[PDB]
Amino acid sequence: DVVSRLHQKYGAEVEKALVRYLSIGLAEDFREAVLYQVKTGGKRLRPLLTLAAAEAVSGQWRPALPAAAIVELIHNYSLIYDDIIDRGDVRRGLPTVRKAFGDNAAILVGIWYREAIEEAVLDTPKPTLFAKEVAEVIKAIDEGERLDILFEAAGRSDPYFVQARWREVTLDDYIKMVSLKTGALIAAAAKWGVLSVSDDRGLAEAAWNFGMAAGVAFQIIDDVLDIYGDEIGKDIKEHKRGNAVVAVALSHLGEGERRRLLEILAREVVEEADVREAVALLDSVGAREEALRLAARYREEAERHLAKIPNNGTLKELLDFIVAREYAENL
């Protein structure tokens, strides 16, 4: 499989780069806490995409290593803060930073990550350009995260999350939110591959579009799982209207059913019977199959952009992996 193969090919050099940028100026008694997040594993799909994109358009991958490190560091920076925000105890089967070291320690670590990202930016072939792209993409992620949280129906005490809670969450709102929270960084992973080794603006734009559509399809599929399992109803227990199946259901359910699903989502604690009841409501408008169809739409869009990129065989394999093409179709 393509991910194992590129991990065996690129993995050691990616990991070296991550530790390298993080270690600059890093005090010895802070080293364990700072490196923890990049030592807990993870798929590294994003840096592999960046390196495969560079290899595709130029036949070289090493010049894109700084970009690959930036994208994976941005990913982990967002995870560290998201774990604090969501009070996540476990990720990749291991304790989170906030869990192992503390919420406040995790904040000092997230601060360190962003400056390690800047060191990496300065080590790219086009520092001023990557500096701008990084600011834009991290603002997209932050805004996506804000919307994801404001799309919850309950569960937060922050005066801001309570007061600014969105009254209604449409399918268009859902798609805008995932494009920012998940799409933008995958789009960046692909585009930065290209920018690292080429000045062809049209190839960089096509890589971006490709990565954006792949990232949207990826999130949609993730949402279907996070409703229908490999537990069951994770996103329902977390009160999320910003989930593809829920969003789709809300756009079809009748008045009574809609009100009731929202009621269930807004419950301070969601129990088994509530999850089964909510899912039944989803299935009653075929929300699962419609969400699956929306994923296929973005997969097909990603394919159209990918066609503009030369030597794209490996990226095509990565795409199938990312959008979990095999599993979705099986379903």
d(CA 48, CA 11): 8
**Residue 230, binding choice from ligand DMA, its own copies, Mg ion, none, Cβ under 5 to 8 Å by partner class:** none
Minimum distance, C-beta of residue 274 to ligand DMA, in the bound complex (Å): 20
Say if residue 148 carries a ligand binding annotation.
Answer: no
d(CA 159, CA 111): 24
DSSP state string for 183-237 = IHHHHHHHHHHHHHH---HHHHHHHHHHHHHHHHHHHHHHHHHHHH-----HHHH
Return the structure tokens found at 176.
């805008």
Taking CB under 6 A as the criterion, the residue among 55, 82, 118, 223 binding ligand DMA is 82
Taking CB under 6 A as the criterion, the residue among 38, 56, 79, 220 binding ligand DMA is 79
Closer by beta carbon to its own copies, 98 or else 288: 98
Say if residue 226 carries a ligand binding annotation.
Answer: yes
Taking CB under 8 A as the criterion, the residue among 3, 108, 154, 266 binding its own copies is 108
Contact flag: residue 82 with Mg ion (CB under 5 A): yes
d(CA 39, CA 43): 12
Minimum distance, C-beta of residue 59 to ligand DMA, in the bound complex (Å): 27
**Residue 92, binding choice from ligand DMA, Mg ion, its own copies, none, Cβ under 5 to 8 Å by partner class:** ligand DMA
Closer by beta carbon to its own copies, 134 or else 188: 134
Say if residue 82 carries a ligand binding annotation.
Answer: yes
Stretch that binds ligand DMA, among 1-9, 75-83, 122-130, 290-298 (CB under 6 A): 75-83
In b/e form, how buried is each residue of 204-241, taking b as 16+ CB within 10 angstroms? bebbbbbbbbbbbbbbbbbbbbbbbeeeebebbbbbbb
Which 234-263 positions form the footprint of ligand DMA (CB under 6 A)?
A: none
**Residue 134, binding choice from Mg ion, ligand DMA, its own copies, none, Cβ under 5 to 8 Å by partner class:** its own copies
Minimum distance, C-beta of residue 249 to its own copies, in the bound complex (Å): 25
Stretch that binds Mg ion, among 14-22, 33-41, 81-89, 131-139 (CB under 5 A): 81-89
Find the helix or strand (DSSP H, E) in which 145 lies: helix 127-150
Distant-in-sequence, close-in-space partners of 283: CB < 8 Å, separation ≥ 6 = none
Minimum distance, C-beta of residue 255 to ligand DMA, in the bound complex (Å): 28
Residues in contact with its own copies, total (CB under 8 A)? 46
Answer for the pair 27, 69: CB distance below 8 angstroms, yes or no: no
Contact flag: residue 101 with its own copies (CB under 8 A): yes
Contact flag: residue 320 with ligand DMA (CB under 6 A): no
Residue type, 314: T
**Residue 43, binding choice from ligand DMA, its own copies, Mg ion, none, Cβ under 5 to 8 Å by partner class:** ligand DMA
d(CA 289, CA 119): 45
Say if residue 320 carries a ligand binding annotation.
Answer: no
Q: Which of 150, 130, 147 is nearest to 183 (CA)?
A: 147
Rg (CA), the chain: 20
Minimum distance, C-beta of residue 74 to its own copies, in the bound complex (Å): 11
d(CA 274, CA 256): 16
Rounded-to-10 torsion of CA 299, 301, 302, 308: 150
Q: Which of 39, 41, 50 is nearest to 6 (CA)?
A: 50
Taking CB under 6 A as the criterion, the residue among 141, 197, 295, 323 binding ligand DMA is 141
Contact flag: residue 118 with ligand DMA (CB under 6 A): no
Give the residues lining the site for ligand DMA (CB under 6 A). 42-43, 45, 75, 78-79, 82, 86, 88, 92, 141, 145, 181-182, 222
> Which residues line the annotated binding site for Mg(2+)?
82, 86, 145, 222, 226
